[PDB]
Design a protein around this ligand. Structure first.
Ligand SMILES: [Mg+2]
Ligand SMILES: [Mg+2]
Lengths: 438, 436
């Protein structure tokens, strides 16, 4: 006899704007407004170095503004054609909404409107619909994902020694990360993260090394070899009074694409030597004998599929192997990968494919093949904490959202603490068993 | 004949919790819940070096947790005594709420519950009332401040070369001010552009482009002076004119290098200066570069020195009390009376309530002093100082370099606000700064 406000979930207004990411560069923010007075706001993150096959991040190319990195073109697409195509449609139909933007854009890689325009509206629509449905975003995502009320708190891998391209050289491997698998809650995990992060500062100070931080809030000191990065991390874990292996395991992103030239992998650090896919695989293998490294990401170039097949036969039984640039959150590429025994895990970045629907497809493909899904940030982040809710709503089991420094990283850790506060053991922290090969 | 929910603004629940700041240290978050189903949520920031007279930040000191930096005690204060005293009180009465907590704590420096506990509730209370009143926070603050509908977009001073507490740079912060911009959106773009050109400049010279707490560069430079030289090189490379388009600001945090009544610059020969000598050094720099604002140019306890610096430089230069005043009307009042400084840096966690913070902005404006709404080194995703800066038409903000979302979420909030208000919230540029 009386209709609730919740039932008036038709899109009435969509606003795009240009905001600033954690590196000082424009990205796109979108608002979605429902008839019933429900609003959702979201932002696109930005990769520092993107995979070849990522959906297109549309930039202006206008030198007089933000050194060419403005996104007004992408925002215009939000405020006009996308807005006009979504007014009148039901926010609660995520897949319906994503399809209308995919079909209206019409290109394979979202090159007309920008993956950055379409994702911002996709995520903002999702938040609006959650509000209209009277639930928090993690709860709405679980329903959109076809796994209602099924939650976990993800085991984080925290990038605390930056390297390679987007640090300051000496170190070739892009990210060394700690995973607090020994924690019984994500709050405890986050504390253990903070402590080892602070103890590492003391260690680097002791050696006269720089304790300023890179894009992901980790340290970029000048180190003799890729190895020594692990060394200093081991010192910090002991100095915090945690036990390497039991309380904290290690993970890496090689971003091996960045140091691949003429079918060979070239390390500035460790001598200056060139390695074959096989030789590089054996180098990584050695590190996993000296240290408890249980996850290695982009261990080879995105286009070295023979390489990845070899690395997967050799290491894949003992070690989680994570596709990032390899799979770019794309079900077409992940499907080819599963079928060729390539990796056993995927890094989930919604802006590599550019819609939440196509993102949840990727997690489902992964989990149904017995691959793990790690919900991931980009080097270029915002105060947006969407990946926190996504990790919880999909029971992904793992998250990569940075060091324990910079609010571009820590907003996600804060959101995970808020969410665990609501859910308690309705979202268990499952620890080491989340990681592929444990 | 029907009562709207806006009118049911009695506090029914307050929740405290331990979240993490931009340095990885715990801080207090508070939620305030009104009967009419309105919520506000806010966090306390934390300073890296505090002034000696700041309202106490309550830490647990429990060495087995966050290296003794837990805030479970302050959170307990929020969930127990503060919640219990505030239940059933009207959130819309910001002054009444802040009064109940200051009285219940009963100490001078909020040393019972902690300034982090009282501030988080103070700010969450404000936001919840704003919701009850059906208005954005800047609009509510303008009404709490006795200045209805009176807005400006603040001229930002952006810390892009860090120093003092890891190089030969004694001066804590070198800042650019895009005074030549027509809007805060343009000002933010100009700061992005200069910040990115500076990176190229530091790479070309082989210096480190990793960032400190406030998202600025921390390279090892020869002298304090070269900090300014590289900033000029970046401004020229970004196609902007030093003086006209971009002015410069410093924070000496001179308290940090003050020992046996002398000012000792470890780098510049490790030489020792008297208040007067150090004032003349700062004077020299304002002849070589368009430095228009100097903060804590002397120790927080050298009131003699500040009286001299204010005589010499006050007419031409904005002189900003940070550790000198700690956003505290008792101290600022003694400062105004003795012709000490002409500008105050406003940190709501230095005094620990919104009401006391609004009092400090009013004391200053009435005295012809400028107010600069500031962050702390420890920040969160919280963007309150944006709304505070617009609501009080303060005219200036220090909320960081154009890097790290702990900073950029403030610029982002300013961009959102300016989109709504347009020319109702003018960017007045250089005329905001004391001595222009
Ligand atoms: Mg990667
Ligand atoms: Mg200061």
């Amino acid at each position: 006899q009386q209709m609730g406000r919740g039932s008036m979930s038709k899109i009435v207004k969509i606003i795009g704007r240009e905001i600033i990411d954690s590196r000082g560069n424009p990205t796109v923010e979108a608002e979605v407004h429902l008839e019933g007075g429900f609003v959702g706001m979201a932002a696109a993150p930005s990769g520092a170095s993107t995979g070849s096959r990522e959906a297109l991040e549309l930039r202006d190319g206008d030198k007089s503004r933000f050194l060419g990195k403005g996104v007004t073109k992408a925002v215009a697409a939000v405020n006009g054609p996308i807005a006009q195509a979504l007014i009148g449609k039901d926010a609660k139909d995520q897949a319906g909404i994503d399809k209308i933007m995919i079909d209206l854009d019409g290109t394979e890689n979202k090159s007309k409107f920008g993956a950055n325009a379409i994702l911002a509206v996709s995520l903002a629509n999702a938040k609006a619909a959650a509000a209209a449905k009277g639930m928090p975003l993690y709860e709405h995502i679980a329903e959109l994902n076809g796994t209602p009320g099924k939650y976990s708190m993800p085991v984080p891998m925290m990038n605390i020694i930056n390297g390679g391209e987007h640090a300051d050289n000496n170190v070739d491997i892009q990210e060394f990360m700690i995973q607090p698998v020994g924690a019984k809650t994500v709050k405890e995990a986050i504390r253990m993260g903070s402590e080892v992060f602070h103890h590492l500062a003391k260690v680097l100070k002791a050696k006269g090394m720089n304790t300023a931080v890179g894009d992901e809030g980790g340290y970029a000191p000048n180190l003799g070899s890729n190895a020594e990065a692990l060394a200093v991390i081991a010192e910090a874990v002991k100095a915090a009074g945690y036990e390497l292996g039991k309380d904290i395991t290690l993970a890496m992103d090689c971003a091996a694409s960045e140091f691949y030239k003429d079918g060979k992998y070239v390390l500035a650090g460790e001598g200056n030597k060139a390695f074959t896919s096989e030789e590089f695989t054996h180098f990584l293998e050695e590190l996993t004998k000296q240290y408890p490294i249980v996850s290695i990401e982009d261990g080879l170039d995105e286009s070295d599929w023979d390489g990845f097949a070899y690395q997967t036969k050799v290491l894949g039984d003992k070690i989680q192997l994570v596709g990032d640039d390899l799979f770019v959150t794309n079900t077409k590429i992940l499907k080819e990968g599963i079928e060729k025994g390539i990796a056993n895990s995927i890094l989930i970045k919604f802006n590599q494919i550019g819609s939440l629907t196509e993102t949840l497809a990727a997690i489902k493909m992964a989990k149904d093949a017995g691959y793990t899904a790690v919900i991931s940030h980009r080097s270029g982040e915002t105060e947006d904490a969407t990946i926190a809710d996504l990790a919880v709503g999909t029971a992904a089991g793992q998250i990569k959202t940075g060091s324990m420094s910079r609010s571009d990283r820590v907003a996600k850790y804060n959101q995970l603490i808020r969410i665990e506060e609501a859910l308690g053991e309705k979202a268990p922290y499952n620890g080491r068993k989340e990681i592929k090969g444990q």
